[PDB]
């Protein structure tokens, strides 16, 4: 529905180029250069050249600059014609076209100011929503946290005043993408599960990419019952996963307690996640949380198990499983303790009463601190 400008594939390719092991890659360079030359994207060409210390082609750069200049002159001429002869609708459309071209040619600040001016002149609620969505897309393209937050708030408010279900679903997809960008995986899983059945924001990513993101985030966020009900038994999710054997194996290995295959698939998923432009900083966190999740899931069904049993189940050595278990217990993530003399992990899961008492102590301590502060404030 909405136009694919700006292309997030361009941002993904740029991030991949910025990566060390893919900095020397050529196919990424070829695809990015083809996209730029199909789009005549000069300012972003300069930005990429200065960020990556690239050798700028003077002929191509000059051709791009001349094309951009003549096109901008054309849009200005159409805007003047609409102002002189036509009503506010045609000048509005001309200004939207100018802003769209500015965003297309990779100008960030120019596109921002043009879209802001258009929004100032925009009256139709649907067109305000479209402009806000364009600003959100630009912010996602440049990973501008403040811009994304402000435009998300604006879109939410606009939809609350008047919101069609299509734009609300699209805003849900954008919010899920941003939540992924800020490691807020629970909300991202919520939104992706809500939008998987009616995903229409193809400008952000393909359906398969969205489904892979949904599977990953739901795995890291949902517990076992919710994961089984909404993801394992998900209709559309299973339908698309029929065409993604790797993601399907990764998802089903943990649910079926096939921990060695799960670990191998998690290594594959980490390798995929490192190259992703959006899941970039959270790959270590995601992997650590998945390892903790697998360890806790295995230990939930056992009171005391030999370290060799985990080594065989996860397909690793005794030393590696011991080191990871010790590190995660030291961080207070697993309810167990290790007997290295016998090499037996004994779970220390608190009973219902003990956990309830500890939660009561914590919550009551917080509430009593608040009460003491309030009383000392008011009693002078």
């Amino acid at each position: 529905g909405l136009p694919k400008n700006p292309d997030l594939r361009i941002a993904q390719l740029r991030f991949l180029l910025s990566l060390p092991e893919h900095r020397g890659d050529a196919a990424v360079r070829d695809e990015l250069m083809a996209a730029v030359r199909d789009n005549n994207m000069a300012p972003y060409y300069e930005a990429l050249c200065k960020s990556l210390d690239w050798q700028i082609d003077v002929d191509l750069l000059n051709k791009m600059k001349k094309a951009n200049e003549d096109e901008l002159k054309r849009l200005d001429e159409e805007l003047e014609d609409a102002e002189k002869n036509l009503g506010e609708s045609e000048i509005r459309d001309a200004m939207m076209a100018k802003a769209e071209y500015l965003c297309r040619i990779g100008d960030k600040e120019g596109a921002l100011t043009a879209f802001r001016k258009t929004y100032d002149k925009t009256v139709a609620l649907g067109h305000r929503l479209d402009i806000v969505f364009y600003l959100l897309r630009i912010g996602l393209f440049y990973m501008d946290n403040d811009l994304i937050t402000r435009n998300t708030e604006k879109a939410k408010s606009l939809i609350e005043e008047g919101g069609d279900w299509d734009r609300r679903n699209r805003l849900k997809v954008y919010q899920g993408l941003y939540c992924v960008a800020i490691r807020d995986f629970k909300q991202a899983a919520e939104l992706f599960l809500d939008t998987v059945s009616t995903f229409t924001s193809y400008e952000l990513m393909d359906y398969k990419t969205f489904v892979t993101y949904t599977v990953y985030v739901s795995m890291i966020a949902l517990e076992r019952p919710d994961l089984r009900e909404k993801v394992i038994k998900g209709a559309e999710i299973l339908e698309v996963l029929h065409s993604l054997p790797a993601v399907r194996q990764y998802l089903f290995s943990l649910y079926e307690c096939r921990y060695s295959v799960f670990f191998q698939s998690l290594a594959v998923v980490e390798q995929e996640m490192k190259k992703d432009w959006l899941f970039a900083p959270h790959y270590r966190y995601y992997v650590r949380e998945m390892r903790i999740h697998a360890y806790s899931q295995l230990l939930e069904s056992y009171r005391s198990l030999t370290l060799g049993y985990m080594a065989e189940a996860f397909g690793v050595g005794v030393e590696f499983i011991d080191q990871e278990l010790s590190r995660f217990i030291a961080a207070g993530r697993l309810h167990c303790k290790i007997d290295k003399v016998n090499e037996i992990v004994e779970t220390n899961r608190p009973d219902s009463k003990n956990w309830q008492y500890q939660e009561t102590i914590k919550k009551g301590d917080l509430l009593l601190n608040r009460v003491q502060k309030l009383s000392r404030v008011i009693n002078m």
Binding site: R183, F263, G317, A331
Partner: protein, 41 residues
């Protein structure tokens, strides 16, 4: 009731980061590959 006697004297990320994030180590894929080839032979 400010405490003026004591004078009041990049990485702008929003997400809460845990101590383990600062810990340096090889990638989990590398560790798994190493353990797999160690236990394979």
């Amino acid at each position: 009731d400010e405490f003026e006697e004591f004078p009041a004297e990049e990485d702008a990320h929003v997400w809460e980061d845990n101590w383990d994030d600062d810990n340096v180590e090889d990638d989990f894929s590398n560790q798994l590959r190493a353990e797999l080839e160690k236990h394979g032979y």
